[PDB]
């Protein structure tokens, strides 16, 4: 109720503001072929790609079963700085779940990790240990991971989809994996392809705004004033939003750091070349 006014910004892909609504601008994916175009990249070792997903069947008796996801990670995990956060997001569906009484599911995850000696996880996401009562349903699963400190240079890495079936009888399941994503940050923002595969079409088309309320932003599309964006704002090479107006507010910056901003114009999936960059530096606090 105080005199302090807050500008709330949200993005969408429909003029009404409902289609693909977000209070947070999407971040680029660090995974490769997340769109399941063909049996390559992330889906290289799945049984097949069909529609926009990958299908794979895990079967074993007193065993660890894995499929290498290594070809689906843009960059090697030893490039990530320790302490940084990365967020994994994925749609998952179990079409068949044949795991008997004696059989136990363990270490069921999609994980980038150190290998021999260490085995410490770098960036991971646990998958449902018993989806038998939720079969044939898309489950969205998210997890933020903190990069562990560097190991000896002799200690290697790997990226795998793993499951362990232990007990008397064989266990098996069939899983569909749709739009896997890994991004830098603590938020699972909307699905985006990788930087090398992204096009103009892949970004939000509409911007929604409202003012003066509490510091926290509404989660109702209708609370916003929706306009078709005419400009795209790139902070340090990555897009952070846009506007219908000839002005934009850069938020969540860190103190005393240099930044570069360049803007492009949008005209219905026709994007102009980016403008000449301009440099600024945030002030230092007392």
């Amino acid at each position: 109720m105080a005199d302090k006014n807050y500008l709330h910004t949200a993005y969408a892909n429909s003029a009404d503001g409902t289609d693909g609504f977000t209070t947070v601008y999407p971040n680029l994916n660090l995974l490769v072929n997340s769109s399941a175009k063909n049996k390559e990249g992330f889906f290289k070792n799945f049984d097949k790609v069909e529609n926009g997903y990958g299908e794979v069947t895990m079967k074993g008796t007193n065993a660890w079963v894995n499929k290498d996801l290594g070809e689906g990670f843009s960059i090697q995990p030893i490039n990530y700085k320790p302490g940084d956060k990365y967020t994994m997001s994925v749609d998952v569906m179990f079409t068949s779940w044949n795991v008997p009484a004696g059989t136990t599911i363990s270490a069921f995850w999609m994980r980038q990790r150190y290998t021999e000696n260490s085995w410490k996880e770098i960036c991971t996401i646990d998958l449902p240990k018993d989806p038998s009562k939720m079969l044939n349903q898309w489950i969205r699963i998210t997890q933020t991971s903190t990069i562990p400190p560097y190991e000896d240079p002799s200690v290697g890495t790997q990226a795998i989809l793993n499951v362990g079936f232990f007990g008397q009888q064989e266990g098996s399941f069939t899983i569909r994996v749709r739009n896997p994503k890994q991004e830098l940050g603590s938020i699972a923002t909307p699905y985006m392809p990788s930087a090398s595969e992204v096009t103009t079409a892949d970004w939000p088309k509409f911007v929604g705004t409202y003012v003066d309320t509490n510091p926290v932003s509404s989660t109702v599309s209708s609370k916003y004033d929706w306009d078709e964006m005419k400009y795209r704002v790139y902070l340090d090479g990555t897009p952070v939003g846009g506007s219908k107006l000839l002005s934009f507010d850069l938020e969540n910056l860190k103190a005393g750091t240099s930044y570069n901003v360049q803007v492009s114009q949008i005209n219905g999936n026709v994007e102009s070349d980016k403008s000449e960059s301009v440099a600024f530096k945030t002030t230092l606090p007392k």
């Binding site: 910056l253 114009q265 070349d273 606090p285």
Partner: protein
């Protein structure tokens, strides 16, 4: 604005050179059909002074605003042609193949100004190209 800009998209990872010429009534552009012009083969060919700038795969050919013309764009790979009736503006690339070519319609923003800068934020304002 700055001028008349023709965009040439190519397959080189570098900066291909572009040479611009202008000429009227070359073969196939005569108003009353083949060889109905005043100088068979084409009238005076003028070399057009261009200012070139580059981004990966895209050459921007800036010509003086006075040359600004409409017209069909023909891509012959080795050269691009901007045909407006009887008039032709010819762009010859060197060391690459023309992928696509067109008069720049969606133009990049211009007077970028950073204002209201604090420790956690800044305001970016600009002007349409």
């Amino acid at each position: 604005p700055s001028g008349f800009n023709v965009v040439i998209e190519h397959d080189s990872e570098y900066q291909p050179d572009v040479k611009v010429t202008y000429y009227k009534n070359s073969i196939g552009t005569e108003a009353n059909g083949f060889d109905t012009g005043p100088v068979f083969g084409g009238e005076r060919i003028y070399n057009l002074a261009s200012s070139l700038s580059y981004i990966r795969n895209k050459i921007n050919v800036e010509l003086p605003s006075v040359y600004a013309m409409a017209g069909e764009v023909v891509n012959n790979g080795n050269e691009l042609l901007l045909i407006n009736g009887t008039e032709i503006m010819r762009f010859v690339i060197e060391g690459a193949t023309i992928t696509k070519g067109y008069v720049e319609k969606v133009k990049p923003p211009t007077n970028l100004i950073v204002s209201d800068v604090t420790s956690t934020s800044a305001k970016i304002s600009w002007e349409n190209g």
